[PDB]
Amino acid sequence: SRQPLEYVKGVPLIKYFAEALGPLQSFQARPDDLLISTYPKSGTTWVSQILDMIYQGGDLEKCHRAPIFNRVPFLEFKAPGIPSGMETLKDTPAPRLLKTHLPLALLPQTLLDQKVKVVYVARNAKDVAVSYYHFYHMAKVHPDPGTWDSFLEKFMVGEVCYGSWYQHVQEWWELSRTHPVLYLFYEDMKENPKREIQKILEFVGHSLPEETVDFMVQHTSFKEMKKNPMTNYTTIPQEIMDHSISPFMRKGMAGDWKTTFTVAQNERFDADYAEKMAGCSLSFRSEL
C-alpha cells in the first residue's frame, strides 16, 4: 500500500486516480450539471452538503439517502473495495452534483464545452497544508507524508497529490473571467455561512424560505457535519480512511495553523508565498 505519486501532464496524482482518468475520458457532461471544484482540504465536503441540501429542497431525510461521497460522484476517484467515481456517476440522477480536485490541465473538456456551472472553494494555503498533512496519514492511499516539516517542503513545491495549491487557486480564479464560476472562500463561509449560502442559492437560481436557510446553516455546521455519519466519511472502509489516526472532520477552524507552523516555517512560507502570488488579485485571510 501507500504507493508513490504518479505524474500526468505535470500533475502528481494518486496511482488509482491516475488510472481513473482512463474511464473518466468517456464521461459526458450535462448542461444542467454543477461542478464542485476545490484544491484538497479547502471545504469540498462542506459546500457539498450545502448544495445537496439545496438540491433536496432543504429536506434532511433525503440528504441522508446515502453518504456524501455517493450523493456527489467524485470524478477522478478510485480505490480498492469501493465503487469508482464514474461507477457512482452512472446511478446519479440529474440534476447532478459533481466533485473534483483536478487542475484545468486534466479537467474533462466536456465540462468546459457544456458551460457547466462551477462552485469553486478556496482556503488559505497554511490551513490547507496542515489539514492536508493529517489527511495524508488517515487516507491510506496517499504516500507516507513523513515529518510535518518535510511535508511542508513538498507542499511548497507542489510535490503533493494534485500539484501546486498556488497554481490551482489562481488558474480557477482566472477561469471565472470567462466561465460561470462561483468563487468562494472557506474563511468567508466560516465567518458568515448564511451569507455564503445565500450566494450559492442565487448562483443556482433556486429560492428557499428564510426559515429553511437557517435550517441548512445549522446542519452544514462543523458540529452537525461531524456528528452526521452521511458526511463525516466514517462509513468508508478503514483501509481507505482510518479515523483513529485522524478524523476527516478534524478541527474545522480557520487560523488553527498557528499551533503547527514554527516561526521559522512561517517566515520561509510568507516569503515564498509573496513571490508566487505576486501579480494576483486574490486576497486570502489566514485567520478570522
Ligand X SMILES: Nc1ncnc2c1ncn2[C@@H]1O[C@H](COP(=O)(O)O)[C@@H](OP(=O)(O)O)[C@H]1O
Among positions 222, 242, 243, 255, the unique one binding ligand X when judged by CB under 6 A = 222
Q: Does 38 bind ligand X (CB under 6 A)?
A: yes
Q: Answer yes or no: is 163 a known binding residue.
A: no
Candidate list 64, 101, 134, 168, residue with the active-site label: 101
Q: Does 42 bind ligand NPO (CB under 6 A)?
A: no
Looking at 1-9, 23-31, 108-116, 218-226, which segment touches ligand X (CB under 6 A)?
218-226
Q: Does 141 bind ligand NPO (CB under 6 A)?
A: yes
Q: Are strands 6-8 and 11-13 parallel, antiparallel or unpaired?
A: antiparallel
Q: Does 139 bind ligand NPO (CB under 6 A)?
A: yes
- Contacts of residue 160, defined as CB under 8 A and 6 or more positions apart, other chains included, come to 5, 12, 132, 136, 151, 154
Which of helix, strand or coil describes residue 276?
helix
Distances (CA, A) of 164 to 53, 160, 170, 256: 31, 8, 10, 21
| CA dist., res. 64 & res. 85, Å (int) | 19
Cα-based angle 130, 133, 138 (whole degrees, multiple of 5): 130
Cell of 37: 471544484
Query: In the window 45-74, what residues touch ligand NPO (CB under 6 A)?
Result: none
| Residue entry with cell 431525510 | 61
Q: Does 43 bind ligand X (CB under 6 A)?
A: yes
Nearer to ligand X, 45 or 164 (CB): 45
Q: Does 43 bind ligand NPO (CB under 6 A)?
A: no
Q: Does 11 bind ligand NPO (CB under 6 A)?
A: no
Among positions 88, 100, 131, 164, the unique one binding ligand X when judged by CB under 6 A = 131
> Among this protein's residues, is 101 annotated catalytic?
yes
What 8-state DSSP symbol labels residue 61?
T
| CA dist., res. 237 & res. 45, Å (int) | 18
- Walk across the sheet containing 34-38 and list its strands: 97-100, 34-38, 117-122, 181-185
CB atoms within 10 A of CB 91: 10
Q: What's the min distance (Å) between Cβ of 41 and ligand X?
A: 5
Q: Does 88 bind ligand NPO (CB under 6 A)?
A: no
Query: In the window 58-117, what residues touch ligand X (CB under 6 A)?
Result: none
* Rama region for 37: left / alpha / beta (φ>0; ψ in -120 to 50; rest): beta
Cell of 88: 457512482
Q: Answer yes or no: is 230 a known binding residue.
A: no
Nearer to ligand NPO, 101 or 126 (CB): 101
DSSP 147-186: SHHHHHHHHHHT-STTS-HHHHHHHHHHHTTTS-EEEEEH
Nearest to 48 by CA among 117, 104, 121: 121
Q: Answer yes or no: is 164 a known binding residue.
A: no
Query: In the window 241-260, what residues touch ligand NPO (CB under 6 A)?
Result: 241
Q: Does 45 bind ligand X (CB under 6 A)?
A: yes
Q: Does 42 bind ligand X (CB under 6 A)?
A: yes
Tell me the binding residues: 41-46, 99-101, 123, 131, 186, 220-225, 248-252
Hey, which residues are catalytic here?
101
Binding residues for 3'-phosphoadenylyl sulfate: 41-46, 123, 131, 186, 220-225, 248-252
The site for ligand X (CB under 6 A) is made up of 38, 40-46, 127, 131, 190, 220-222, 225, 249-252
